[PDB]
Structure formats: C-alpha cells, structure tokens
Structure 1
C-alpha cells in the first residue's frame, strides 16, 4: 500500500485498502473508514457490474435521481475528489464575510457542511448535493468580485465539474 493518504498526501495513522494500494486517514476517506475496500474500489465495482452505466447521460436526468445507495456512493466519491485538491482548503470550513464593498451570501455553504449533510442522509436527490456544491463556488465568485482570489473558486469548481461529468458519465459535448 501507499505510505501517504490518497486525499491529503500526508503520512499519519493510515488505513489501507485491501483491494488496491491506496491508503487513507480515517476522516479523509468518505464515508469515514469503517477486509476493507476503499471508495475508489467500490465505484470501480459498480462500473464493472453494469458496463452500460458508462454510456452517456443527460445532466437533467442525473440530477433528478433519487439518492439510492449507488447515487449516495457516487456523490460521496465526487465530494472526495474535490477534497483531493489542495485548494479545497479554502472551501472546507465555515466562511465569514467582512470585506469593504461586498456583502456576504444569503446562504453560506462549505465542504464540511456538505460532508455532514451526506453523512446524515439529508439529500433525497442528486440535485440537492450538486446544488450545494455549486453554491460554494458561486458564493465565492460573487463575494470576491474583482479580487484575483475569485480565481480559486473557478479552479475548484472546474475540478468538481470534470469529476461530476466523469463519475456520472455525462454525455460528452463540444
């Protein structure tokens, strides 16, 4: 197995996958680490049991799906892919807003709040999860305005959207 956490790339108390060489801190894995197979493995098994699941889909159909166990897993994995990027640190914990010339968002949102909501089964459809994730980056863009720091929200949103299209097999388009 790897000697560093797959998500944050640090050493420490690591739990090892039994079906692949990845390792994880307890609370870096999503769900929190519970023979054991990691979320990467579990996602791969879904694809292998249903190869047609990789044919292209419409985003509108994906968003209306109820959060059954396989969609719950795919959202957990998508959330984990965002935490895998180091720039997720800016969006992980609860933000506060006191900048001259700006007003904070009406509905603040952050990654650890989405993690908790997933863990507590608060989303009934994929749309709920995706709306909250996109809201993180939209709030950031609106608040920081012309500050170059706005770019961090564009960057991490791009990671979210690329992984969304991959994990839920969104039909490729020009």
Structure 2
C-alpha cells in the first residue's frame, strides 16, 4: 500500500506515487523540470537502478558480490546500533502505540534491517540506506519532527550514510578497518592506493594513502593516527625518499607513521613485486600509476601483467 506522507518533507498532501516502491512525493519537493507521465520511478529507485547496473556500478560494487556486501552491511548495522538507539532496535510494538499502523504503512527497525541484509536482500549500499531511511521518516511522521526520538533517528541515518560512503570509497579498506587486525592499515588493497606526501594548511607534510580524487581534492588517509582529510591535489606529491620538511612538535609520532608506511611499502612489494619512489616534489595526479610501473623510467610499459586472474572474514 502506498505511503501517504511525502518521503522528502514527511507531510501529507497531493503526492506522486512511485511505480516501483511505496514512496510518495509532493511534486514541489522534487524541484522538477515538469511532472511525470505514466512511467515514473522515484529518486530512490532511480539511484538504486543506476547503482545495481553491472556496467555503471561503483568500483566498490564491481569489487563486491551480494554476499560480500551483506557481510559489510553487518558491520555497518553494528555501528548504527549504538548505545541509546534502543527505540529503533526492534519493531514498534502495537501494545504501546495502538494507532501506529494508521500512520506508518512501512515499518522499519534495525533488527529488520539486519535480518534483511543477512537474507541478501540488498544489492547495493544505496538500497540499504534507502531502506534504513524508513526509520527516520516513520519517526518524524508519528512522533513529530521536533520530538527527541527524531534526533536519535537522524543520528542513526547519519551513521548509516557515513558507513555506506566508506564501503563505496573502498570495501577492502572498510573491512580492514572493521576487523582491526594488526597493522590493518598497512595491508595493501587489490588496486593499491598511491602513497603521497600530503600537506593540509596548518599541518606538517605527512605520509598518506590517496583513496580517491574528486574535484581537485584528494581523500588522504594518514599513516600513524589514521586520521583523514580532503587535501588539495596541488599539496600532494608522490612518495619520495627525500622528505618535504615541516617544523613539527610531534617527532615520535612522525617516526611511528613513517615506520608504518615502510611496512606498507614492504607489503606492496611483497604482493605486487614493485614500488617506485618518485623524484622529490613530483606532483600526484589522479589515478596515478607511477608507483606500480614495472620500469618507472618507461611509463609506456605500464604495470606488469602479473595477474593470474585469481579471485577475509
């Protein structure tokens, strides 16, 4: 049965109906070039469609099976199920809220989410977040937007959003971070992240993994403390023997980070057989291949075809 409350603003009124799911939307809340005809898939269903399409799925998703994703979603639910999320951990009981089903046509809770994930019902992170969002929508409808429960539901979704985003950035990093085995941060990924010197305004030059590029910013994960930041691409250099010098007050901390990095370099060398340090102050460029070149003096020869076409919880 279709919902009566707009998925965007959580209010009733004249609402559009999705063909593919029970969500409904005020035309106005969608900021359209014009209202639809006849075939309309909502923005949630559009997103999920674009994502679960083999040829336009994300690096993360192309890497992942449904089953592998379900294992990762299990970790994400554990993050969502923090202390103080009591109200949303099990289905709302009718004994306490006898009129709940007059307002809420599509109940959801964290336990249901977990069971659904285990049953391999989610084909992508997008589908998981969209389903989790019923918790927040429902809470706002029934309790009110300013109710204290809504604060808690908002945090649950913000946690979900963060976790989904992290899976999408790199599922292998995510799994590593979840299990926290020793030197998890030194374990190379199947498509290894470039090592850079990264300088954030206000901070000393520091070793990091470059996880992605977006609009001239690099998603840098720093050795040592395992902090993170977007770093301007022009402030990122490929890793070199010579260190770009910064005054600092944290000498043992820097040493620890450099130690960690050298383990990582040893691991990359072990797993892929190469690692190329670059000349001092070599700009990092998007999707940099340099560190993996067979012969760094011959970029046209590229990386070594060493894959055997082969394919940890």
**TM-score normalised by structure 1 residue count:** 0.52
| Structure 1: 5+ residue stretches without partners | 1-58
CA distance in 2, matches of 1:123, 1:163: 15
Name the one with the larger strand percent: 2
Offset of residue 108 of structure 1: 0.3
Mapping for residues 55-94 of structure 1, pairs under 5 Å: 63-64=51-52, 67-83=65-81, 85-94=82-91
Q: Please give the per-residue CA displacement for 1:113-133, whole angstroms capped at 9, x wherever unaligned.
A: 111112222334444322221
Offset of residue 72 of structure 1: 2.1
Corresponding residue for residue 15 of structure 1: none
Corresponding residue for residue 139 of structure 1: 138
CA distance in 2, matches of 1:165, 1:99: 37
What RMSD in Å do the two structures reach over aligned CA positions?
3.6
Report if the CA contact (8 A) 1:82-1:160 is conserved: yes
Report if the CA contact (8 A) 1:78-1:167 is conserved: no
Q: Please give the per-residue CA displacement for 1:47-72, whole angstroms capped at 9, x wherever unaligned.
A: xxxxxxxxxxxx86884257533322
Q: Secondary structure at the match of 2:151?
A: helix
**TM-score normalised by structure 2 residue count:** 0.31
Corresponding residue for residue 117 of structure 2: 118
Corresponding residue for residue 21 of structure 1: none
Q: Please give the per-residue CA displacement for 1:121-173, whole angstroms capped at 9, x wherever unaligned.
A: 23344443222211112211222113333211112222222222223229778
Name the one with the larger helix percent: 1
Mapping for residues 1-174 of structure 1, pairs under 5 Å: 63-64=51-52, 67-83=65-81, 85-96=82-93, 98=97, 103-145=102-144, 146-169=146-169
Offset of residue 93 of structure 1: 0.6
| Structure 2: 5+ residue stretches without partners | 1-46, 171-211, 216-229, 231-313
Change (3 A) 1:106 1:60: closer
Structure ID, larger Rg: 2
Report if the CA contact (8 A) 2:104-2:138 is conserved: yes
Q: Secondary structure at the match of 1:149?
A: helix
| Count of aligned pairs between the two proteins | 115
